[PDB]
Symmetry: D2
Subunit: 125 residues, 4 copies
């Protein structure tokens, strides 16, 4: 008859309803990700044939690295608008520090967070 047990926990996310001990086939619940995490895919899982469908993934935000920025000779462009943490899919804009210019082959000064990873621009004297 295909009933399911309690829905699976996922990293950095939670279901939006109170977990029950058993669910009828065709039942569904939904996830939400922790605030700065981006929910990837379909938020809803459905019970069918004794198994829940695949939960979504909560994609990681990116944190600025002081060490990397110092090494690459860059700084945040907007000191009044500092995205110290950025959501996946969200862009962060840097500038070369005074006395430096973009190196060749460097990434653009504007760069996009993807699941924890920022590819930083590099500046050279």
């Amino acid at each position: 008859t295909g009933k399911c047990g309690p829905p699976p926990p996922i990293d950095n996310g939670d279901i939006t309803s109170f977990p029950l001990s058993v669910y009828a086939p065709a039942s569904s619940v939904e996830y939400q990700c922790a605030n700065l995490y981006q929910l990837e895919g379909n938020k809803r899982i459905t019970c069918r044939n004794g198994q829940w469908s695949e939960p979504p993934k909560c994609l990681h935000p990116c944190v600025i690295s002081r060490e990397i920025m110092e090494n690459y000779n860059i700084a945040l462009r907007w000191t009044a608008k500092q995205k110290l943490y950025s959501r996946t899919g969200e862009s962060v804009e840097f500038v070369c520090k005074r006395g430096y210019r973009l190196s060749s082959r460097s990434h653009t000064l504007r760069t996009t967070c993807w699941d924890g990873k920022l590819e930083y621009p590099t500046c050279a004297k």
Copy 2:
């Protein structure tokens, strides 16, 4: 020119992006409510003329009361599906305990959570 400061915190909710010190007019951010809380209204606030628009409200879940249920001679209908906490808008179904029947003027056995409040059915011997 109408810039705004950091978005206002709301009870039982958070914005989905990292707060900035200043926002240009027309900028917007969005809220999400804590997992069992229901977001009422529009999740997005927009900055215009120096003020953020009105944030949404996170409506409270309902918790079952043992004392009230004992007093009213009721129990949860489905012992395998116990909604100890219910979301606003979600219904909970009771039954009269063995030897009792609904009193007249009683609420229906099925009853809906609204922002923390459940109106309980009452059974009589």
Copy 3:
């Protein structure tokens, strides 16, 4: 015999264990407050004589107001260390904007967040 039902939800906080439908006298659970909220009092509630003891309170963080700061002619002292949100009990330090000085009877430039409220210093030309 004094058993208790599911522990009460509190604003901006959650219990650290999975809620059960019934608790024996002497049982206890504990709360934690949402990240920037300060837990006031004892985090643990205990079941006795059919009632849970009093839960703690989650004290609100304070958010900086651009409008108030502009009106009072002040700015954050440390632009590299901007406490846009401060925890209850945590202090925030302002400076008079260029061309202003503290007014008499003004609060000190350093001021402490208490449950959502900051008493701002005031500067005059």
Copy 4:
């Protein structure tokens, strides 16, 4: 001089203060884990010589599996006290279903959650 950047995010946890763009050596922040997650080790990280110390780990709760329980011929012992999710370090107690008894070499009926893993008892007809 050894200043640090914004503290690192950790899975299933958050810092308790608002992130700053730079921290002086000797500064510290603290983490808390999401509600059913158990914080392993020291909650506080300290900035020294340009690096944060190692953050704690948030150990996973365990979810009961209907499929595994059905296969092993077991059920939760206390239907009024169902730990559908258990914290790391917390124990869950099963019983053999009617008509079964513990198999030899089986784990005890009482078993402890560790970071997502429950070792289930097994019953045989």
